[PDB]
Amino acid sequence: VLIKEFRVVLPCSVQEYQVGQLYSVAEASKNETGGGEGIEVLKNEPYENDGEKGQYTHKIYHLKSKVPAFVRMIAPEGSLVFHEKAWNAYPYCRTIVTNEYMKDDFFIKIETWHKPDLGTLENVHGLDPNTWKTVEIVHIDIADRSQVEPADYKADEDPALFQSVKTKRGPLGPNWKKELANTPCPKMCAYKLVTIKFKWWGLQSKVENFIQKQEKRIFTNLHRQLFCWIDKWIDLTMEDIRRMEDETQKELETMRKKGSVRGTSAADA
Numbered sequence: 001v002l003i004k005e006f007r008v009v010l011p012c013s014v015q016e017y018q019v020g021q022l023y024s025v026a027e028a029s030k031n032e033t034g035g036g037e038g039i040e041v042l043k044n045e046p047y048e049n050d051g052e053k054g055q056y057t058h059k060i061y062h063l064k065s066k067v068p069a070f071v072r073m074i075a076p077e078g079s080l081v082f083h084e085k086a087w088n089a090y091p092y093c094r095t096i097v098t099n100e101y102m103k104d105d106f107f108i109k110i111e112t113w114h115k116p117d118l119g120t121l122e123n124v125h126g127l128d129p130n131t132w133k134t135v136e137i138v139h140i141d142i143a144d145r146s147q148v149e150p151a152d153y154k155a156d157e158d159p160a161l162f163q164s165v166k167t168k169r170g171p172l173g174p175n176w177k178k179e180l181a182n183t184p185c186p187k188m189c190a191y192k193l194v195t196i197k198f199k200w201w202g203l204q205s206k207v208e209n210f211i212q213k214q215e216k217r218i219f220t221n222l223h224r225q226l227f228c229w230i231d232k233w234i235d236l237t238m239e240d241i242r243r244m245e246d247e248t249q250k251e252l253e254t255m256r257k258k259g260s261v262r263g264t265s266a267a268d269a
């Protein structure tokens with residue numbers, strides 16, 4: 001088992017992010033879908049478990065050629081399908097990724113708190129004090145080029161080179177964070193606690209570390225994009241998002257069937 005907390009500080013409010021995250025996840029999902037691989041949405045509906053209200057989503061990721069060669073080698077044919085269930089009770093979210101073949105020996109749990117600060121809160125998820133001390137804290141800086149994998153870099157998705165037309169939140173320079181700190185502009189931080197378990201003798205350490213590395217990468221590219229697409233979603237209402245999600249669900253079903261594979265790829269070459 002491996003636990004890490006990823007902190008993503010953004011130049012936007014917690015309120016704006018609720019819309020921004022959904023808009024960005026919808027677009028990022030389409031960018032990964034095609035040629036038999038990609039995202040499939042099974043459910044996206046409201047819920048009210050116990051005394052909690054929120055949005056529930058059930059999605060399946062088809063990652064045949066997106067996983068590294070070593071994973072295709074050990075995985076039975078047709079088992080590289082992953083279910084992602086998420087109970088989004090924004091500003092809080094609980095997501096769990098599972099795999100049918102792995103049953104209980106595999107899971108990716110992502111628990112996120114969205115707060116109006118700059119990633120200074122400690123143990124926001126209130127984990128056991130001693131356990132918390134063994135959790136690695138990863139600070140994701142969407143403006144830091146060094147945190148981007150060369151293969152993923154795109155100058156048109158570089159927040160360090162982009163300026164919003166509708167908010168004027170100019171290009172994020174090296175010291176944008178400290179600047180924002182003393183700039184009473186919207187600010188927030190997503191504390192994403194990721195707990196990974198991959199029980200498989202001989203590969204546990206390797207696979208758990210691999211998945212954390214990939215979650216880091218996915219969080220990094222997604223939020224860099226989220227920021228650069230800010231003019232696309234900054235003026236949207238939750239209602240426009242629910243309309244977009246309905247359209248997206250349908251567009252995914254069709255994309256996944258046609259064309260070739262597109263999007264992010266992982267390789268332990």
Ligand SMILES: CCCCCCCC/C=C\CCCCCCCC(=O)OC[C@H](COP(=O)(O)OCC[N+](C)(C)C)OC(=O)CCCCCCC/C=C\CCCCCCCC
Nearest residue numbers: 028032057066071075079086088095110211214215264266
């Ligand atoms: C033997 C049989 C088993 C073999 C398996 C062993 C090998 C292990 C290899 C792969 C296993 C891991 C697969 C996990 C799939 C990755 C997706 C993921 O982990 O989704 C969770 C993240 C964080 O959850 P969230 O609540 O923050 O967001 C959700 C927003 N809500 C709540 C509104 C819905 O969701 C997001 O960021 C959403 C961002 C959307 C963009 C998705 C990009 C990923 C698509 C392709 C990349 C694939 C690379 C392969 C490596 C995968 C490792 C991660």
